[PDB]
Amino acid sequence: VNSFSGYLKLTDNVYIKNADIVEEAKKVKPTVVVNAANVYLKHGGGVAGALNKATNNAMQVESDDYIATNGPLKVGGSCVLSGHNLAKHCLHVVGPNVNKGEDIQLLKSAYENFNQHEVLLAPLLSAGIFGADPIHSLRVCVDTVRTNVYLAVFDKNLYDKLVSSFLEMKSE
């Protein structure tokens, strides 16, 4: 398990790869895969839709059961559910939806949930549907997370931009 390979090491504990998070999960067999969730665990598009599709909708049914028992998550919060065929566990983390005016500072709270797990395969939280600048999401991750985070960025042009931007900011 946790057989990560081909990552670029950004810091002592943050790694990045140009890869689809679902294909990485199948390759790596991680203990924890992170979902970029919303408070009602309605896994539609982006990472949540991709993860859910790869579980043949089991992650959505499990999430429906969770919500019916526990109610919606809070923004910046998380829950640990099954990783189904992709991982031992899925950590569902809710970044702020910047497009709806939710506090961008809650992206720090969101990434703080990573610190409860020794190693994670994760996406850039809030950087898609939720409208945060991906460069900002990466900076918050690097600054907030102390545990080992392996970031999967599927789009090559974004990957290239993130790496070059990270280098410029790291040295200045």
Kindly indicate which of the ranges 53-61, 63-71, 84-92, 120-128 contains the residues binding ligand OH9, using the contact rule CB under 6 A.
120-128
Single out the residue of 87, 101, 89, 90 nearest to residue 37, CA to CA.
90
DSSP letter, residue 101 = T
* DSSP bridge pairs for 119: 148
Please say whether the beta carbons of 32 and 90 come within 8 A: yes
Instruction: Decide whether 33 or 119 has the Cβ nearer to ligand OH9.
Output: 33
> Alpha-carbon distance 59 to 163, whole Å?
31
Q: Determine which residue in the list 111, 120, 126, 149 makes contact with ligand OH9, applying CB under 6 A.
A: 126
Q: Does residue 111 bind ligand OH9 (CB under 6 A)?
A: no
Kindly indicate which of the ranges 67-75, 125-133, 139-147, 164-172 contains the residues binding ligand OH9, using the contact rule CB under 6 A.
125-133
Instruction: Decide whether 94 or 172 has the Cβ nearer to ligand OH9.
Output: 94
Residue 101's region, left for phi above 0, alpha for psi from -120 to 50, else beta, is left
Structure tokens at 136: 């900002």
Interaction residues for ligand OH9, span 54-93 (CB under 6 A): none
Q: Determine which residue in the list 111, 134, 159, 166 makes contact with ligand OH9, applying CB under 6 A.
A: 134
Give the dihedral sign, CA 76/83/162/131: negative
Q: Does residue 122 bind ligand OH9 (CB under 6 A)?
A: no
Q: Does residue 133 bind ligand OH9 (CB under 6 A)?
A: no
Contact footprint for ligand OH9 (CB under 6 A): 20-22, 36, 38, 46-48, 50, 95, 123-130, 134, 152-154
